[PDB]
Amino acid sequence: DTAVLVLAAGPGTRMRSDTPKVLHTLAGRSMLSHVLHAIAKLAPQRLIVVLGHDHQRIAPLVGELADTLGRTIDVALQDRPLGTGHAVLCGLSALPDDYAGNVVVTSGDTPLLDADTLADLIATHRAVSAAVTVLTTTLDDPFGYGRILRTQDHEVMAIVEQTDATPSQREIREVNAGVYAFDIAALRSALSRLSSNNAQQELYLTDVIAILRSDGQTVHASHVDDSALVAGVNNRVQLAELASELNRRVVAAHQLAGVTVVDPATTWIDVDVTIGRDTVIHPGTQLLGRTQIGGRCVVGPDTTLTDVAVGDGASVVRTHGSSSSIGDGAAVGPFTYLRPGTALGADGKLGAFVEVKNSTIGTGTKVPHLTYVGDADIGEYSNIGASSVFVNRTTVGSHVRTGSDTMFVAPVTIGDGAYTGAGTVVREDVPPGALAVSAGPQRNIENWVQRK
Template identity: 60%
Template sequence: TGRAVEMAVEALPSSFVGDVLVLNGDVPLLDADTLRDAVAAHRTTGTAATLLTTLLDEPHGYGRIIRDDHGTVDRIVEHKDATTVELEVNEVNAGIYVFASAPLRATVTRLTQDNSQGEKYLTDVVGLLRGQQLTVSASRVSPSWKVEGINDRAQLAQAAAHLNALIIRGWQLAGVTIVDPGTTWIDLQVTLGLDVEVKPGTQLLGATTIDERAVIGPDTTLVDTEVGAGAVIKRTDATLAVIGEGANVGPFSYLRPGTYLGADGKIGTFVETKNATIGAGSKVPHLSYIGDAEIGEQSNIGAGTIVANYDGVNKHRTTVGSHVRSGSHNVFVAPVTIGDGAYSGAGTVIRKDVPAGALAVNVAPQRNMDGWVVANRPGTAAAEAASRSSDSGASNSPAQN
């Protein structure tokens, strides 16, 4: 850090006479108020430098603040260079400084690499300033987590968990119900309305916004997703989706980017959507894939419906009108349009446009081949069951004269 600050000072205009604020890049929980307070304290005291310190129960790895008999900051000793006595000190350097530019310019060039790590320590500037009879003050930060550094992924996870706890508490105090803070994750950019309820196992990430009275979870992940007032979303994964007011999503729904679900609409169990607009009051309740499609208002898509949007080369769109009723296990082969108020029968494969109000069916007539199992699968459990059923039916038939 000493060489880095030396280069930064060289880049400053020679006419610059202000203060220089130096920050470590691995202190993610440092807040603006703490920095403002440090700058204000520095300018009030008029010292050559002001550094931030904190008290740690386990200060391993941190530079120690060494004070003189009057309690004034005398120097900073890096952990690897500290004596046994100095290691007992639990006031540590937070790595954040405010320097008056003139003494910093004059001193930073005097840094040497005469230490255990062969580096230019910025911390040595403090001792050099004191050697010139200049005053160095310290501003102690509490709580210490604000200035704790990150040196490994374990510390990174701890800092992230602490920030998440602060975010959750803030939303709780703002009128959001979070049932289990320990299993809930909320990013800093997320916005929640009054009386939103977040159930266990939920992650709200990115720029997700949730309007008032919505219920989210359990076991739900929303990324950059907009949720309308009063919507209910459970056991769902959604990214870049818009879910309307009063809508119902889940369980086990997968909303991919470009999904728009209208007010009071439904995306149900084991349904996947992508680049799809589903109008107000329309429902896709079960076991379906709706991709590159537009569905009007108050339509119902039968269980097991698949939008076949890809021909092996290009994606095509499907348009379904309002008040449509499609049967179970349909396939819409895009590009295709189904008009308002149309119906389709179960098992229908729709390859051609369906006019408004029409019934689309293309299932072949059912043919029953009596005795096929006994003749073609003799000795199987199915054949034996069929034989017993046939014998029972024959014995119960009216006697023939």
């Protein structure tokens, strides 16, 4: 039986942002969403999130996540940011007075922490009968982490914060993950002896280590060798470094599953995105939100797709697109903009300098050049001439061939198999198999240039 507390009530001053720290994103989720997904998979009996100033702006996000994850998540309020030890004390108040399960604590700014690392923690805590088990790791650059102090015995003595450490203690490379498991009674007891006489004038959760050691209680450190899983984010530099590490891992999982990613370093893939076998992804590409790519696609350099579905065997090159679907075998790009509600059929083509918004385009239809399609439905096997505009519902049937430089002034219906001449303004319905024209005849003015 375990209760997990997430400390998320700090002011996040080092982010220098008007967005609460724990709402900053990587790979398609806030740090708080990453942390809650990992814990929810671990499925503890209780899950409590400590919130502070701006609890108004965060608590709703937590409620949405509770639904999505289909479990209860309690919010405990911490009025003033008195320190991580104080935050835990606030967190404990959402538990019953007589709770006897283990208490796991972690921060909202350790967003790679995973369900396995948490389960191992609880497993080592239970195995060694610890009063406190602390996750640690070792880093080439330990700046800003609490340093782990050990006796000659290699026994854990204390955690000393960066601001409080000596120059010589700052060289210690073993760090506090800030992820812990506690016997609850031992935790209550240590928390009531915290004082804030330290460099930050805060009530440090980390002091409980030394306090419990005082009492002869069992204090266990568990080393996490994969440092990233417990890496923290205090500022935007660390946020970007961790986003990059997470992205390499996401790309690697796709590569091992059968996706060619020519250049992992310039391919950003959000966590929910799925990609089919074979699919080749070219450099400078972001696949964002719930984008789904099928098999044997080419997703060409410099493409950004957010919530876009792409079938198998499709080509989507130098394209910027959101909330759109692209059918099997279709060709999009280069230099194509898809706005929400675009649906392009199998074997369809949207070519260079084409933008589509809220339009359905049927199987095998091509819009190859310099055209805007807005709020229109176009049938199958049709061909829209270069440099045309759907001036916003206009319906265009199947096997239609419209001439270059046609404007379609909505609303208008173009029947199946109809043609339009080059340079037509279409303001009225065009019967099936009719040709609609409006351009006047060419006149040549001989020797105009000699004269003028």
